[PDB]
From Swiss-Prot, chain A:
It comes from the Eukaryota. Interacts (via N-terminus) with PLK4; the interaction is mutally exclusive with a PLK4:CEP192 interaction. Interacts (via C-terminus) with CPAP (via-N-terminus). Interacts with CINP. Interacts with CDK5RAP2, WDR62, CEP63 and CEP131. CEP63, CDK5RAP2, CEP152, WDR62 are proposed to form a stepwise assembled complex at the centrosome forming a ring near parental centrioles. Interacts with DEUP1; this interaction recruits CEP152 to the deuterosome. The interactions with CEP63 and DEUP1 are mutually exclusive. Interacts with CCDC66. Residues 1-10 have a biased composition (Acidic residues). Belongs to the CEP152 family. The chain holds residues 15 to 47 of 1710 of the full protein. This is Centrosomal protein of 152 kDa. It is linked to Microcephaly 9, primary, autosomal recessive: A disease defined as a head circumference more than 3 standard deviations below the age-related mean. Brain weight is markedly reduced and the cerebral cortex is disproportionately small. Despite this marked reduction in size, the gyral pattern is relatively well preserved, with no major abnormality in cortical architecture. Affected individuals have intellectual disability. Primary microcephaly is further defined by the absence of other syndromic features or significant neurological deficits due to degenerative brain disorder. Seckel syndrome 5: A rare autosomal recessive disorder characterized by proportionate dwarfism of prenatal onset associated with low birth weight, growth retardation, severe microcephaly with a bird-headed like appearance, and intellectual disability. It is found in: Cytoplasm, Cytoskeleton, Microtubule organizing center, Centrosome; Cytoplasm, Cytoskeleton, Microtubule organizing center, Centrosome, Centriole. Necessary for centrosome duplication; the function also seems to involve CEP63, CDK5RAP2 and WDR62 through a stepwise assembled complex at the centrosome that recruits CDK2 required for centriole duplication. Acts as a molecular scaffold facilitating the interaction of PLK4 and CPAP, 2 molecules involved in centriole formation. Proposed to snatch PLK4 away from PLK4:CEP92 complexes in early G1 daughter centriole and to reposition PLK4 at the outer boundary of a newly forming CEP152 ring structure.
From Swiss-Prot, chains B, C:
Residues 1-114 form the Cryptic POLO box 1 (CPB1) domain. Homodimer. Interacts with CEP152 (via N-terminus). Interacts with CEP78; this interaction may be important for proper PLK4 localization to the centriole and PLK4-induced overduplication of centrioles. Interacts with CEP131. Interacts simultaneously with TENT5C and CEP192. Interacts with TENT5C; this interaction leads to the TENT5C recruitment in the centrosome. Interacts with CEP85; this interaction may be important in cell migration and centriole assembly. This is Serine/threonine-protein kinase PLK4. Serine/threonine-protein kinase that plays a central role in centriole duplication. Able to trigger procentriole formation on the surface of the parental centriole cylinder, leading to the recruitment of centriole biogenesis proteins such as SASS6, CPAP, CCP110, CEP135 and gamma-tubulin. When overexpressed, it is able to induce centrosome amplification through the simultaneous generation of multiple procentrioles adjoining each parental centriole during S phase. Phosphorylates 'Ser-151' of FBXW5 during the G1/S transition, leading to inhibit FBXW5 ability to ubiquitinate SASS6. The modification Phosphoserine is found at residue 80. It is found in: Cytoplasm, Cytoskeleton, Microtubule organizing center, Centrosome, Centriole; Nucleus, Nucleolus; Cleavage furrow; Cytoplasm, Cytoskeleton, Microtubule organizing center, Centrosome. The chain holds residues 586 to 807 of 970 of the full protein.
Amino acid sequence: EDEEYDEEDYEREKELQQLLTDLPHDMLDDDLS
Amino acid sequence: TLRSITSPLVAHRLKPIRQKTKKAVVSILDSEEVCVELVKEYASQEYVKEVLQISSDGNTITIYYPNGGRGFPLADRPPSPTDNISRYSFDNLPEKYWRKYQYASRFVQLVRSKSPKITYFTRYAKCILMENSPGADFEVWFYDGVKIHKTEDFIQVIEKTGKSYTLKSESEVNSLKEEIKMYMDHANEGHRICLALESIISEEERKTRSAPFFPIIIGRKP
Amino acid sequence: TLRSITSPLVAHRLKPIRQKTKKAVVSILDSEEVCVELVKEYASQEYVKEVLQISSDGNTITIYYPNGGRGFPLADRPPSPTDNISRYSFDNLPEKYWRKYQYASRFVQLVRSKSPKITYFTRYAKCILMENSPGADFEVWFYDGVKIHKTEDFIQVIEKTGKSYTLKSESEVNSLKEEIKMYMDHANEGHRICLALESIISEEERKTRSAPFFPIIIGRKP
């Protein structure tokens, strides 16, 4: 009586992937003194 | 001071997710703890030079340097803590790491913005209230094919055509086709219902001491 | 009070099902209508002498005889009525057709007893509150093997492997298997929660207009 991932789910998971990629990665840069 | 800029992250109820990248590996474990692992590459193999682990409520931060030659060998799960480790409260976190806690805070806030808290099935659409409260994102996928994306700032309509555009203000949405307002109002009623449903249920949850009452899936796709 | 043989059936929320018997075919349709088909067969070819259609609330019953009594070769999905129909409300239903309809009423009450209304995932188990209220059945799924079936009377217990015991009342054997007593006490908690959640959500559903608030799925699989 239950289902899995539909289109809405996969689209959302993909938007997350793009969002986490756009995450500034130059904030994990070290040495700020 | 940290807490000038940012508030302690909230990673409760979130699903386990790991994210590789050229610099570091940020993830959310099964215990809903946020782990940030700095990564360095040497001899065609990756090495870990620092691990930040933040509690589910974002109040407790543990940082350990497995300081050794070659650092830590990168695996698929966060490495066991060494002996030269540290633990601070959110307010007692040093001026260092502040750039990294803010990064982890954004990561979590992004994940919550794509994490369903309430799924509601109407006659015409699938409604989803997300986890990034307060003012969580609201997404409406009509079976008709139209998509509506509500933010605290935005309203975003994707017509069956694929014709997409954003409506920021109350005046902007009023500049409408008096037919698309049906999609607008039905979505807004679905948003009203979910916000109402969320409130009375989370109220009962404060009354209890049990497993989370979220996420919820209400009704079924017809 | 002739009607007190059975209260009018309730087929709402139930998914379509079809049960064939030697002398009747009980079928729940989309639109949630119940169909009692009085069957018969000549030379291994089945047909229908009589058909009863009942509304989803059980208040209205429609009785008609396909092909004028000649009947129609058995189809999986029941045939449409002609202009020749007889119809009655629940109370002023004629004395006959009471073996029928009630036959459906007890069939609907069975499908309700296997239809999940509320699903609650815990850190341990998986709780399910059925639709056959007031005597709403309660099933508990620990994936370790154990199970509990609360109902009209017999609270049933299952040892983890294909093993099993049983129970009737609530004065004695609730003090047995104490290393297992922690399950009845646990299930009664989940039963209390799933009953509380049905209550408060049903009231919000009663206030407004939109789509059904049931069934729901609480929490995630551990």
